[model samples]
Target: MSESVAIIGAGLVGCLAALAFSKEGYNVTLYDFRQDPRLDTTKNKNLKSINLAISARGIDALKSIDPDACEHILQDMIPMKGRMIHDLKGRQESQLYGEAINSINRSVLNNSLLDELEKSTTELKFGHKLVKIEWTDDKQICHFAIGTPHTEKYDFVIGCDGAYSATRSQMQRKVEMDFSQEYMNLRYIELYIPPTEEFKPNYGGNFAIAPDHLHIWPRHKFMLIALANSDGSFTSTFFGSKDQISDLITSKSRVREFLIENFPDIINIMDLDDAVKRFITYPKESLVCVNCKPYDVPGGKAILLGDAAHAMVPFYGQGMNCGFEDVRILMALLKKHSGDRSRAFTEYTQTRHKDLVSITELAKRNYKEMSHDVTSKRFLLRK
Candidate 1:
């Protein structure tokens, strides 16, 4: 009989992990604490509208699992060729790159991955939040918050439960794992830009600006970025320190003046009133970097992947890509060992921790580099 694996968290990483393992012939059952986002009855619709630029690493991982499915899911991605920096004077400078990273809606990617799961034999259980794990000689027992029998036995467990992962905490109880969670003062608010009225054929249709570039209106301490969506509208995000965001959010006029001063050009593209309204009312999200060592529990009974292992700042845009690479790496190790998961899992922590650490640290530095350094003459000259 095939090995039964219980994969925790049904977000981007969890879903991909399930798919990867399923492709390898593991009896994968993916679990999530939250309600199915795709369901009509699921009321709490806080689905992130943030567009994720899927890089080659993430794409390669998906292709490894199922090439056709990967291509199908990524069909609607908008190709972003480079970054477009908008200075204070509203002058646009194009920082060109040879290749492109594709942007897709976060919800769209997750739902599409889930849809792919539905097509496979892999079982997806919603509202099945992992509570505890009991490790034994042969099987690992997983306790969930809901279900007929609160506990289920699996050959092994894969925890892809994001930052603030309950699985990571649970694993800490069993292993002498080194862990740290640092919250950057950086808070982000999601804003929007509606599509243009007329279909401009030059820079694609309906787009106010060049759709092929990731737009940045960078102010040293705080910055605004816009990523293209398939609908021609852009998903704009504002990032700033807690104090700055808190102070500006106090008055509509202050928000207006700040935006106008920093990003004058957006006045024509984005409505000043709507931008100010969103600045006040929109949710301000904190960015955190999580670092943990020995991602896998001894004996391969349990393992943590994705943000559960190493969550990084989004400035580098490698969180999801790194997570996908985790699946790819783990899958490759498993294959190399001819399905000896214990050895594979052990070696995974030994080898993967260094790379994860580097990326996690690099991601933190990139917040400053992308938001501030790019504006500097020396940094631009060096680039």
Candidate 2:
């Protein structure tokens, strides 16, 4: 009989993990505490409308799982070839992304991954929030706060429950794992841009801004970025230090003055006052990075993947890509060990830990590159 694996947190990482296990012939069950995100509801409002840039790492993993499926789901992605920096004078400079990157909708990616999993026999249990974990000799038992009021057993488990993973917490109780999570003093506010009135077809029938280039406003101490969406619009996001945004949030006049000065073009395009008001009123969230060693629990009956294992800031635009890589790495390990999950899981942590740490460090450093260093004469010359 094939192994039965229970995966926790049906977010981006969790869904992919379940799909991977099912591909390996495991009877997989995916659990999430939240409702199906694809359902239509005001509460389901997506923070950003522009797509995440899916790069080689993510594309490769998708192809590994199923080529046609990945292609079909991502058919609408807009290619972003580079960043367009908007300076104070409204002068736009192209900081070209020499390589190819696909701007993908966050919800689209999540729903596509979920749809693919549905095609398989993998069972998805909504509102099943993990509360406790029992790692034993033969099977792993997952306790959930809501689901069918009964425990589920699995030969092994993969937890991709993000930085606040309940599975990681439950496992820490049973094992001495070294873990630390730091929240950067950075907060993000999302914005939107309707297509320009002169929107017309260009290369290969693409939209304005090449549809292939991510637009950025590289302001020192803060930055603005825009990504292409399939709907002739772009999702723009703002990132800045706490003090910077806090001053604006305190009053309407201050917020209006800030936007009119720093992002004049944006003000002319969108309802700057409304956007500023929203920023001042809407809750801003902090970015976080979590580091831990020995991701697998004792006896190797369970392991954490994705953000649960290595959460990093999104400045590098690789959170989903890294999580997708985790699926590839774990799948390769299981294959190498001939489906001996215990050995595969143990070996995975030992080998992949260094890479994850290195990437996290690099992602952290990228904040400066994006926020301050983008306009440096020396930096531009080097590029």
Candidate 3:
């Protein structure tokens, strides 16, 4: 008989982990604390509409799982070939990525993956939040925060629960895991710019700017970025220090002046009144970086993947890609060991730690490059 595995969290990483294990002939049960995102009310509340850039790493992982599923899930992605930098004078410069990165809707991608999971043997248990874990020699016991509080036994566990992972918290009780999380001084506010009034054939719709490029306004201390949506509107995000954002929010006039001085072109495309309102009223979301060592438990009873293992800042745009790579790497090792999960997971921690650490460091460093280094004359000349 095949072994049973319990995968925590139903986000992108968890869903993929379940699918990967199912293909290996494991009986998989995936759990999430939240309601199903496909529901109307739940979807609206859960999806923040943050656009993600799915590069080669993410694409490769999806394809490795199932080619048709990868194609279907990525059908709506818009190709971004380069970055369009806008200066104060509204002059534009292009920095190409050589290949291309595709902009995708986060919610859509997650929903599509869930739909794929429905077709497989993997069982999804929504609204089943993990409460704690009981480790033993025979099997791993998982407790869920359902109405009555229930427990289930599994051969092993995969913790893909995100940044604030309950699974990772539970693992700490059993293992001496070294973990640290730090918050950056920066915060981000999301805003939007609607499409042009008239449709433009060049961009295939009413695009306010070049849809083929990722638009950026990089000031020394702060920056604004915009990515195109299929419907023509752009999702824009503003990043700055808490003090900077708080100071600007103090006076409406000051906020208007700051925006006009730094992002004059946006004033033409966006409603001045609405933009100011969002700037002042928008939630200030902080960014955090998490690092942990020895992501697997002894004997492979449990393991951490995705953000549960190493959550990094979004400056590098590699968080999801890195998580997807985690699934691919772990699956490959399991195959190599011919289902010796204990040995595979041990090797996974020993081998994967260095790469995760390096990427976390790079993601932290990229903030400086995105906000300041991109504008340097020397940097531009070198490019």
Candidate 4:
């Protein structure tokens, strides 16, 4: 008989984990505290409204789970060939990634994954918030509070919750998990740029700018980025210091002036008035980096994946990609151990630690590279 598993959080990583384990013939039950996003009444909208970059790392992992499902999920994604850097004079320069990274709607991808999960044997329980866990030698007991409290036992637990993971906190009681969380001195706000009046045959939509490239307006301490949407609109994000954003938003005119000065070209494409309103009114979200050791409980009764394990800044765009890779790697290790999770999970914690730290560091450094270093003469010379 297949062992029963409980996967926490219904986000991208959790959904992927469920699919992977289900494919391995494990009886999987995925749980989330929030209501089903597919339902209009309780749909949780993304605050930043950010688009996800599904590079090779993410793609390969999804394909590993199910190639046909991967194709269907990625059918609407727009391929971004390179970065388009804009200057004060509205001039643009292209820095190619050499390989294409995809621009996908986070909600769309997540909903599609959830839809796929529904077709499988995996049971999804939404609106069931995990309050605590009771770990025993034989089984990991999970407690939830939906309307009233309830408990269930599973052979193992997988935590794919975000940075502020409740699962991670529970694991700390059972294991010696070293953890630290640091918040960057930066915040971000989301903005939007609509399609142009006319449509272009080559691009398939009415894009005001090159839809094939990720657009960037890098200032010394602040940066703006835009990724194309399938509807010809662009999801834009502005990253800046808290003080800078706070000061700029003090006056509507100041906010408008700042945007015009730093990102002049954007004014032509986006409504300056609405942009200023969003810049001032939208909540400023802090970027946090979290690091932890030994992402698994002893005896392989439980393990953590995705942001619950290592949460990094968005500068490198590896958060979800790394999470997807986690599912792939963990599944491989399980296969190697012939489904002996004790050996597989122990080895996973040991082998995956080094790479996780390295990527976290790289992600931290890339913030400088994207916002400041890219413009430095010395930095440019090296490139």
Candidate 5:
């Protein structure tokens, strides 16, 4: 019988990883901490905004796996050609993000992948939170925090479990590994510009923001950005320093004043009063980047992928793209080694580590570009 593999986390990357492994004829089982999103009630309705962006790098990786599958997913995408910068007074300026970027609904893309999974024999275990990994010469064991401390043993393990991954921590206990976490001071609050209740952008009668550009409102240290949605709405995120928000919240009057002065156009679209209330009252969250090295276990018994190996800020818009790349890279290694995974896993760590480290670091550096540099005269000069 072919050796079996265990993959923790049924997120975007994990799902891709599991499907790839199954195509290689390995018995694959995927685990996740939450119930299948398709079968659950979301606490935050805003979580499923009209759409999210899927760029060339990410789409290329998906297509390499299956052209038809990729096309099916692409059918739902609303191509966003560049950034639409909205100024302090609500004036919008366009910033091109190259010709390869496109916005796709989060649920649509995820469901497409889930559909791919359904076509296979892979078992997806929802609500399975990984607690630990135990590695031995011949097999690896996965400990979970579900069903009275259940454990599963496999020929090897793969963790795409996200930033706070327990499998990565457990692997660290077994070997010397270096991991680092850095948090950017920028905090983000999400808002929605529901479909114009009226006019739709040209193509397909969808999108609030222009379908061709990613919209940005650059206000120096504080800024706002929006991505087009297939439903004609836009998911707008506000970026500001903690102190900047604090200054606004000193009083209701200050909050209103800040909204009027810095984000006047929002008043034209969003309910000004509610937007102000949420901006000050809703908990602002900081973005963190996690970088780790030697993602695979020493004996090739297990490996970490996706955010577990590298969690990065969204400024680069490559968080998902990078993780998708991980799936393709690892699968290629498995194929190149001709199914000899032990050597393949080792070679993957040695060759891919540098690129992984470089990308994460680059992502960390991009926060400034997205926040401040995006508004520079030089930025405009390029246009």
Candidate 6:
């Protein structure tokens, strides 16, 4: 008998989970609360980091699911060999990451992932929000109520929904789980760095700076980071304490002064006036680290993945990679048990929690290390 699976949250993790599970010959249906992003306007378009970094863990996961598809999907990715640390006086420090990681466009990758699903039998249900889930011995009932209220049932469910996950919340009622959510004191604002007026071949044609390295302006308490985009630009993010941002955002002049005072090296790379205006106007988002133990309900009726179970901060840049590995590991367990989710889910909870929890804490620890240590002698030999 074939079993049906409901995967909540059609995000990066959710989309990949759908692909992985679909290949397992299951009746898979992926659900998201928002209108389809491929057609939705900016209102419903939830843009994440704009750029995503995929390491071996994530790549291996995709490759294991479908080698050809993974190769094709990541064909456009740019390899990052190291980090470029810029000091206050515009001095530079280089650090290598051994082999290499990769950078890909978030929206492009998500769209392409969705496109790949067309070649499979997985069903996509857009605009259906999961408001509740009713768990039972035989089936798990999911309720959706964004525009219209409706419900669906599946043999099992996978919750890839993000931090503050509705799926995790529901599972808590059925299982005695340990969960903790702590908000980092930092606030982040998205910024941009446009390419040069003309393509200069020295810096990879249109790239203003070296594209093969993650650029960091570590100003101790506050920091700025940039990741290259394939379009000859960089997706920049500025992070600082909430109090610091509030004071700096009090006026455009303050934001300008702050940027120049801290990271003067980017003066020529970024449009100072435009950056100031946007800095004062853009949304200031907070980061939270969420962790939970026993990421599954008993008997395999439901389970959690991605940020729903272990949402790590972006300091280590492993949030998405870890989630992809979750899909990979879950699928491997399913195969090991011959598609018996009860055994698979049980093992996932037992063996998965320790590493996931440790990585989250590692991510949190790296926050200070990168923000503070990058400029110190702590990273001198790392160059």
C-alpha lDDT score of every prediction, in listed order? 0.85, 0.78, 0.84, 0.87, 0.75, 0.85
* Highest lDDT scorer: 4
Candidate 1 Cα deviation (angstroms), residue 207: 0.4
Write candidate 2's Cα lDDT for 6-64 as tens digits.
89888778888888889878999998888788777526533333358788788888888
lDDT of 5 by residue, 1-383 (tens): 88889998877888888878887799999998777777656343223234566778888888878788788868967777677767654667766665377877776676667778889888888778888777789888888887368888899899888877888898898878888988876677777777777665374454455766777777667777787776677778777787777777778888787767766667766777777777777776657778777888876788888888888766464767888888888888888878877788788788778887687567646655666566555322221
> Model 5 off-target regions past 4 Å?
41-50, 97-99, 201-207, 281-283, 373-383
lDDT for position 13 in model 5: 81
Off by over 4 Å in 3: 374-383
lDDT of model 1, residue 228:
89
Q: lDDT of candidate 4 vs native?
A: 0.87
Tens-digit lDDT track of model 6 for 1-383 = 78999999999899999999888888999999877888856365787678888887888999999899998999989989898988777887889894367889888888888888879998998887899999999999999886578988999999999987899999999999999999988887889999777887877759989898988877766778898888899999888888888888788888898788777889989999989987888777668888888899999888899998888767464878899998899988988998889999999998888777677567657775776555564323222
lDDT of 2 at 59: 83
Best by TM-score: 4
Error of 5 at 132 (Å): 2.1
- Candidate 1 runs further than 4 Å off: 147-149, 372-383
Off by over 4 Å in 6: 40-42, 373-383
Error of 1 at 44 (Å): 2.6
Residue 119, candidate 4: alpha-carbon lDDT: 89
Pairwise lDDT winner, candidates 2 and 4 = 4
Off by over 4 Å in 2: 45-50, 203-210, 372-383
Look at candidate 6 and tell me the lDDT of residue 186. Answer: 80
Worst 10 residues of 4 by lDDT: 374-383
Measured against the true structure, the TM-scores of the candidates, in listed sequence, are 0.95, 0.92, 0.94, 0.95, 0.90, 0.95
Overlapping backbone residue pairs in candidate 2 total: 7
Clashing pairs in 6: none
